[PDB]
RNA sequence: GAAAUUGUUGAAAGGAAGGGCAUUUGAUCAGACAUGGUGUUUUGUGCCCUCUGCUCCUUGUGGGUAGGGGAUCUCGCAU
RNA sequence: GGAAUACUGCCAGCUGGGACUGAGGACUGCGACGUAAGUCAAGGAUGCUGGCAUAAUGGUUAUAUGCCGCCCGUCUUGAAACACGGACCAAGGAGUCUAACGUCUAUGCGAGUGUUUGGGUGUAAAACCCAUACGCGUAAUUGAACGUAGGUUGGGGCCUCGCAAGAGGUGCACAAUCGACCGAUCCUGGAUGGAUUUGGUAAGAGCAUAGCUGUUGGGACCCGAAAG
RNA sequence: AAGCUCGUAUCAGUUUUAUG
């Protein structure tokens, strides 16, 4: 006669195969999803690139009709500033360590993105000897976003190296990629807190071209390199990423 | 199989090992606080840590790339049957030269190696 | 947390062994309380008495609701009427087990429980008084 | 299992961003005002 | 029959020696009775083909063991 | 008047040279090339070539070379220092045992628990059983069921509603509040009615053995002093 | 070290506004 096969055989066969013919199915509803997803990502990177070309031309072109009006233009206040620690753990102050470490400034060479506020600023006033600051542009912004970028799942840290990965966690804001992660970085949007959390605190070598000035320890505005540095902290952190 | 990286080849030895003939070269602790070994101070001999660690997928191979495995009889070498690539027969050092050829016999027919063959033996 | 049992009965072993993976499994949360409690000490996991379970009974719907125990029960004297129920536990005192075995009442272990109610519905776990 | 690095390794960088097709497409940075 | 210690031979090195990182030179020790694997072509065999038997349980998709006939034969072995 | 150039910044622009790294180990995923087949630099080195059994290589030690390293342990002290001991070697050498009182962990039983002071038995200090007493707890401010031997509010958990968020129902231990008997404040006059807090029942949770561990007395981690 | 609840609104050698 013919051996039957085991009935929890035939049990175990019966569920893996209606377990499957679920599975095949999901797998398939999850590529056409992830199509969309990689159209919306393509509308709103390119929608984004727009609206950061139309902003530049706009304020070189409200600029230029100052100048040509004879009259002053204000431009709008800097309202995102990012920190790097440049001293160490060693004889750091008490007030100046909780400061940091609120900051999220555990270790040397490392930062991350501050909101610029009323009560931000004293703070910031307040560690200028231990940290060097200023405004960040678009490109180092994106540039720090895609190499040492990762993100925080819930407890660790995570290399951001994939949209959907940004999706799982940052998607319940409507945040579902890299660019948009850099776009609500660079404009401090509602949910800018979030996504600053999210990204975890930047590791960064040593500049590639030194710091340059003799001694570290003084204020950018008398040769040294802590303070101030506005338009030169992109360059600077271009050289230690 | 992965290379057999030895994080420290040197023996380590205890501190004044040789200045002192009463001084067993089985590695101990420095207690003294005063000691410098214990600092670890420049120049010193190197202390045992953690560091030092192999790792798991080459531990205990030797440079051969087989396993030891101490081998009393017929029946502990036909134990080797299903892993003669990853464990090797060790003779021990009790065997009668005697039971040493027929074990040997028995490796080659299995195909086992032998870490020291012809021991106590002449041809 | 505690994570391992201290005991070194192999049964109980086995019990944290079925009940870790019925919780990682499930997901209902009965299954990781009594998991937990599976790790208590015996001074953490005092004898809930005959009469506990019967005064407790009286909840509504309890008629149906088996009642759980993650310690020992024991005999009470002080009362006459145990509601017939079923209750599960590790062990049974004779007394305890003659008394809900006499009243219509049936005795079951852990995994018995367990694969009756993998998902603890209508389940009611009792705990002992500690003071 | 390892990190690829954006900014260098383009099939990487597309994956990331899908966009960046279209910024190959005429470079998107020497656009003439 | 080991050290502390003592005398000889040899090597080395010379108001000191001792240890650590890396290496040259000198001396010296290990360093497979491994001698394979695969498909093809002759020939002789068996547990191989065929006929005839015996024997153990249980009963089973078995095991053990004999007497007559050949190289349909690579099913294995040795050439 | 117009080119540029000088300088800052951008290129998800191009193109080389140099150094280290090859980690994972049959496919599961995100992506690109292409109408498709298929391919790819896309969740970790692939292919070829060159030397080898009197091998290739690796190993032990003496010296040497570039650099570093105050003599070991103890105690003073805030420090470095002084000082206390150290000629060398083989053996010997020090929180061990006991009685009581505890925490934690494990085992057995459980409102019962403890065979081994003894008796029976015995292959004999071994092994196996328990008649009567005994220690502990099982209940006390006289006595606690009228009720979850308690209403309400939270409360691990369970059930119904629902794809989720959440809503409703039911609730162990535990916590807040207010509760019942029965006695002392403190009135009242040997009671009576009770002033306002009072300590039990509340609902048993305990007994025996094994392990680390703490205190005390015994020599008490070891060596040692004027004496009687 | 061990038990309860809670992963919640629990906090801070941090800053600013209001009560001088």
């Known amino acids: ?241 | 199989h992965p290379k057999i990286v030895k994080k420290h080849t040197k023996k380590f030895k205890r501190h004044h090992s040789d200045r002192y003939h009463r001084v067993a070269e089985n590695w101990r602790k420095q207690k003294g606080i005063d000691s410098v070994v214990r600092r670890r101070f420049r120049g010193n001999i190197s202390q045992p840590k953690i560091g030092y660690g192999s790792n798991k997928k080459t531990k205990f191979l030797s440079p051969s790339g087989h396993k030891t495995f101490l081998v009393a009889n017929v029946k502990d070498l036909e134990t080797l049957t299903m892993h003669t690539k990853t464990y090797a027969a060790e003779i021990a050092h009790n065997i009668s030269a005697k039971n040493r050829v027929v074990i040997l016999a028995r490796a080659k027919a299995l195909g086992i190696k032998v870490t020291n063959p012809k021991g106590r033996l002449a041809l | 947390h505690r994570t391992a049992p201290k005991s070194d009965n192999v049964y109980l072993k086995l019990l944290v062994k079925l009940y870790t993976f019925l919780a990682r499994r499930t997901d209902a949360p009965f299954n990781k309380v009594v998991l937990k409690a599976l790790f208590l000490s015996k001074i953490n996991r005092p004898p809930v008495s005959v009469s506990r379970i019967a005064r407790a009974l009286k909840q509504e719907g309890a008629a149906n609701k088996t009642v759980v125990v993650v310690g020992t029960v024991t005999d009470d004297a002080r009362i006459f009427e145990f509601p017939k129920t079923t209750v599960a536990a590790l062990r049974f005192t004779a007394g305890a087990r003659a008394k809900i075995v006499k009243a219509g009442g049936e005795c079951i272990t852990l995994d018995q429980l367990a694969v009756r109610a993998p998902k603890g519905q209508n389940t009611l776990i009792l705990r002992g008084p500690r003071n | 299992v390892l990190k690829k690095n954006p900014l260098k390794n383009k099939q990487v960088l597309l994956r990331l961003n899908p966009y960046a097709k279209v910024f190959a497409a005429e470079k998107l940075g020497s656009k003439k005002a």
């Not at chain 1, 031309?57 to 790097?84: C, M, P, T, W």
């Not at chain 1, 900051?103 to 040397?108: A, F, H, P, S």
């Not at chain 1, 799942?153 to 994939?162: F, G, M, Y």
């Not at chain 1, 999706?167 to 319940?172: D, F, H, I, S, V």
């Open chain 1, 1 to 241: 006669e013919k051996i039957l096969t085991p009935e929890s055989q035939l049990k175990k066969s019966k569920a893996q195969q209606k377990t499957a013919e679920q599975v095949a199915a999901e797998r398939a509803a999850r590529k056409a999803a992830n199509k969309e997803k990689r159209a919306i990502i393509l509308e709103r990177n390119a929608a984004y690139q727009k609206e950061y070309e139309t902003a530049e031309r706009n304020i070189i072109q409200a600029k230029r009709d100052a100048k040509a009006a004879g009259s002053y233009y204000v431009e709008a206040q800097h309202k995102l500033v990012f920190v790097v620690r440049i001293k160490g753990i060693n004889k750091i102050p008490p007030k100046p360590r909780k400061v940091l470490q609120l900051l999220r400034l555990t270790r040397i060479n490392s930062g991350t993105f501050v909101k610029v506020t009323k009560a931000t600023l004293e703070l910031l006033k307040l560690i200028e000897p231990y940290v060097a600051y200023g405004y960040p542009s678009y490109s180092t912004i994106r540039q720090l976003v895609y190499k040492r970028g990762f993100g925080k799942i819930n407890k660790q840290r995570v290399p951001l190296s994939d949209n959907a990965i940004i999706e799982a966690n940052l998607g319940k804001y409507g945040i579902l990629s890299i660019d948009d992660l850099i776009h609500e970085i660079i404009t401090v949007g509602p949910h800018f807190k979030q996504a600053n959390n999210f990204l975890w605190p930047f590791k960064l070598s040593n500049p590639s071209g030194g710091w340059g000035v003799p001694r570290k320890f003084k204020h950018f505005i008398q040769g040294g390199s802590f303070g101030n540095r506005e338009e030169f902290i992109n360059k600077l952190v271009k050289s230690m990423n």
